[PDB]
Amino acid sequence: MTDRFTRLLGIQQPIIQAPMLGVSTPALAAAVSNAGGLGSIAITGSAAEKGRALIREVRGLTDKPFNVNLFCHRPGQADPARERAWLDYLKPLFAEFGAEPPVRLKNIYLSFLEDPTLLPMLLEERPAAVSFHFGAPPRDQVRALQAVGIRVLVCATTPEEAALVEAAGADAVVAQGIEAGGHRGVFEPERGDAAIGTLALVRLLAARGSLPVVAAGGIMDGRGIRAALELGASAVQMGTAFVLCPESSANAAYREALKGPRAARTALTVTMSGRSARGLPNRMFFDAAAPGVPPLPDYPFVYDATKALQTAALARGNHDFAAQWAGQGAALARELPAAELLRTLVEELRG
Amino acid sequence: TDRFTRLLGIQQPIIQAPMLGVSTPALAAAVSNAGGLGSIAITGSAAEKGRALIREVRGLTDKPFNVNLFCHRPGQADPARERAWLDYLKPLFAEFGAEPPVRLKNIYLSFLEDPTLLPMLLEERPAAVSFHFGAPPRDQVRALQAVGIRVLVCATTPEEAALVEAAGADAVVAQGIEAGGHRGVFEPERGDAAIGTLALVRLLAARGSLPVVAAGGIMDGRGIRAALELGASAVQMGTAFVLCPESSANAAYREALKGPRAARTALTVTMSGRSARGLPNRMFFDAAAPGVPPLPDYPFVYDATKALQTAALARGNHDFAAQWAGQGAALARELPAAELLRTLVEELRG
Numbered sequence: 249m250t251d252r253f254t255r256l257l258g259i260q261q262p263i264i265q266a267p268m269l270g271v272s273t274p275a276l277a278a279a280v281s282n283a284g285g286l287g288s289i290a291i292t293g294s295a296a297e298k299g300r301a302l303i304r305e306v307r308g309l310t311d312k313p314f315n316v317n318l319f320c321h322r323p324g325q326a327d328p329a330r331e332r333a334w335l336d337y338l339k340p341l342f343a344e345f346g347a348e349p350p351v352r353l354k355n356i357y358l359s360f361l362e363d364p365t366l367l368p369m370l371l372e373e374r375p376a377a378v379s380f381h382f383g384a385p386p387r388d389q390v391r392a393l394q395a396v397g398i399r400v401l402v403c404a405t406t407p408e409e410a411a412l413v414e415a416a417g418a419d420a421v422v423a424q425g426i427e428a429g430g431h432r433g434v435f436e437p438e439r440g441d442a443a444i445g446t447l448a449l450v451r452l453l454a455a456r457g458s459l460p461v462v463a464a465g466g467i468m469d470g471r472g473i474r475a476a477l478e479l480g481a482s483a484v485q486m487g488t489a490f491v492l493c494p495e496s497s498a499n500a501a502y503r504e505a506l507k508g509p510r511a512a513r514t515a516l517t518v519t520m521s522g523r524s525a526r527g528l529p530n531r532m533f534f535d536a537a538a539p540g541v542p543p544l545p546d547y548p549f550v551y552d553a554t555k556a557l558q559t560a561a562l563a564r565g566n567h568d569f570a571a572q573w574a575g576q577g578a579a580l581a582r583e584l585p586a587a588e589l590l591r592t593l594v595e596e597l598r599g
Numbered sequence: 600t601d602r603f604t605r606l607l608g609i610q611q612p613i614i615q616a617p618m619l620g621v622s623t624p625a626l627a628a629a630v631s632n633a634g635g636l637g638s639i640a641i642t643g644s645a646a647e648k649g650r651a652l653i654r655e656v657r658g659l660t661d662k663p664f665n666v667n668l669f670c671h672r673p674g675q676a677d678p679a680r681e682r683a684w685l686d687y688l689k690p691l692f693a694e695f696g697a698e699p700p701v702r703l704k705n706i707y708l709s710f711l712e713d714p715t716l717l718p719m720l721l722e723e724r725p726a727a728v729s730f731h732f733g734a735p736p737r738d739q740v741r742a743l744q745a746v747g748i749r750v751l752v753c754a755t756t757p758e759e760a761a762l763v764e765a766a767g768a769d770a771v772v773a774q775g776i777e778a779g780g781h782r783g784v785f786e787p788e789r790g791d792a793a794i795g796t797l798a799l800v801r802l803l804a805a806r807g808s809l810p811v812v813a814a815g816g817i818m819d820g821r822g823i824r825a826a827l828e829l830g831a832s833a834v835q836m837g838t839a840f841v842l843c844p845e846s847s848a849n850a851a852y853r854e855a856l857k858g859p860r861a862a863r864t865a866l867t868v869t870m871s872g873r874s875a876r877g878l879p880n881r882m883f884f885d886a887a888a889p890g891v892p893p894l895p896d897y898p899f900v901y902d903a904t905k906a907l908q909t910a911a912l913a914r915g916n917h918d919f920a921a922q923w924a925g926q927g928a929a930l931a932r933e934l935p936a937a938e939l940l941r942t943l944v945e946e947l948r949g
């Protein structure tokens with residue numbers, strides 16, 4: 249086994265439990281870090297002070313390194329006319345549940361690039377690792393984090409995005425293949441999505457690049473981890489494998505969805521949030537290019553609209569609109585305390 | 600594992616993929632003589648011409664080889680749809696001073712619609728017969744197995760791997776999204792799950808009955824080792840053999856795959872009517888874009904494209920060529936096929 253990543257992070261095992269906004273928790277992160285991996289939390293969507301309190305919660309439960317994740321998308325551009333047309337299109341769905349769409353949509357997830365309170369807070373709290381999704385911060389901000397001993401990780405979905413992660417000065421690249429659950433890390437989705445599978449992406453980044461590569465997407469057991477290291481990865485990041493952990497904040501309907509037959513087929517959708525994301529298809533996965541569908545508002549305003557519909561639906565016992573993200577290996581998902589899943593993966597990695 | 604090797608009577612768990620228009624009897628023999636499983640594709644040829652190709656392979660090797668056929672839902676003619684398609688293409692043909700064919704032909708008969716292929720295979724008896732786009736009716740997998748032939752079927756999903764199993768094929772070729780050339784989806788009007796090799800191979804090895812041949816993105820022995828770790832019994836590699844001098848890739852295609860265009864592949868349905876992965880060019884356009892008419896069936900669309908390729912090529916223009924390649928294309932190497940095979944085996948052990 250290579251120590252290129254474990255050395256870097258000061259951990260025992262080359263396994264990262266994916267940050268998963270709405271699913272990871274301080275209990276989940278601490279569990280994995282205490283078992284010898286790198287546990288993770290996502291803090292986007294919170295005030296800096298509330299992210300601070302979440303970082304301190306994890307520190308309260310583990311003395312080991314953990315990872316704090318922030319979204320670094322292009323800041324969403326409000327478009328009130330486009331947003332009104334979208335809301336009008338969604339009216340019949342709200343009406344099914346005796347609800348009306350919201351009157352206005354909000355930028356619910358501020359990017360690291362538009363919230364200047366986040367960097368100073370992280371320079372104070374100094375978690376072991378800070379990770380970025382959807383883009384890379386400027387090199388001088390990455391270096392400010394490293395000057396205080398924080399390791400910086402950034403997700404890339406292509407070699408061209410991996411070149412940008414290198415130019416930002418990150419410590420490692422998270423190579424997110426098509427198999428991955430949740431939002432695709434594509435930097436500029438208006439330019440398309442190469443939709444490179446994990447087996448090819450990890451090989452290309454390890455064969456033709458020199459930052460340490462963390463493989464992310466479809467990995468559910470030790471055979472998958474061993475395959476990723478054979479491709480040249482220095483570590484793995486696994487999200488869907490940790491969703492059934494009892495430490496996770498997945499709800500009962502999501503656990504049921506993932507343990508059941510729907511796990512056999514995932515799909516990508518832009519209509520849930522405004523950005524391409526993979527999960528178990530439902531009534532929120534519709535064809536945005538069908539006749540009569542108006543133009544999609546920007547991320548994350550579309551997600552604000554969806555969350556109000558999810559609220560209205562859940563207020564009538566209906567879970568057909570929920571965000572139940574999941575990777576293409578979802579049918580191999582197991583339910584176990586995170587620290588024992590972690591140890592099971594290690595035994596399988598070495599078995 | 601030697602699940603697969605013993606079964607096929609070969610030394611090495613490496614299949615050089617059948618690639619219509621790229622694989623040749625010389626390529627297949629080189630790989631078979633070096634210890635893997637060489638392959639040829641015979642769809643699109645009369646049964647007698649297929650027989651002549653099998654005999655060409657046997658002229659160069661007496662080791663096991665694989666003979667591939669397309670098992671797609673047979674194409675359905677729709678004259679008005681075809682006429683509007685050819686109309687839309689008209690200005691392209693015009694740029695090279697030609698115009699479209701008047702009608703379009705079912706240039707590639709599925710195994711399902713050409714009753715002469717099965718009799719022809721029962722006599723010639725290659726070691727393996729493989730099918731793409733679908734699983735043949737079960738009695739026939741039986742009929743080939745009856746006479747000593749191993750039957751392989753490509754699938755792109757666990758659901759399609761079921762349909763292969765019930766068919767009692769001997770092995771399933773698990774084709775990930777990384778794969779070059781035409782996607783093996785059975786029923787594309789029904790959608791495309793577009794599953795990556797890493798997930799598909801693990802799913803089929805953990806949940807299915809058959810030896811799994813991993814296909815898509817594998818370019819070196821590390822990729823081979825990875826596939827075996829995921830539970831595959833062997834690999835099938837197409838893009839890695841395209842640069843072999845034994846292939847029938849033309850010079851333009853070789854230069855395209857060696858150059859910077861290998862950094863990015865894409866899927867198109869506008870080249871043939873079915874989703875296929877290669878180096879994008881002027882045949883890779885958005886079929887849903889304003890002004891583009893409904894697409895005709897596979898393989899009729901390919902018939903129109905071949906016509907336009909013939910016309911561009913007469914003017915020395917290669918921008919409409921079919922230059923298929925997988926997502927590992929940037930790792931392509933140019934070696935004699937047997938030397939590639941030896942290098943892969945070395946890497947698989949190192």
Ligand SMILES: Cc1cc2nc3c(=O)[nH]c(=O)nc-3n(C[C@H](O)[C@H](O)[C@H](O)COP(=O)(O)O)c2cc1C
Nearest residue numbers: 266268269381428429430465466486487488573575
């Ligand atoms: C439920 C879920 C939520 C996700 N949310 C985020 C997140 O908040 N931030 C992030 O960096 N990645 C997120 N991801 C993606 C993961 O970081 C990682 O790319 C992905 O889980 C890997 O694929 P796998 O799920 O097949 O393991 C999400 C993934 C899932 C499954």
Ligand SMILES: Cc1cc2nc3c(=O)[nH]c(=O)nc-3n(C[C@H](O)[C@H](O)[C@H](O)COP(=O)(O)O)c2cc1C
Nearest residue numbers: 616618619731778779780815816836837838923925
């Ligand atoms: C140039 C080329 C032509 C292809 N044509 C066919 C074909 O005729 N028959 C078939 O079963 N598969 C065909 N394929 C698909 C391969 O069998 C296989 O799934 C693919 O090569 C695997 O990915 P790789 O190219 O990344 O190795 C072809 C692929 C390539 C690259």
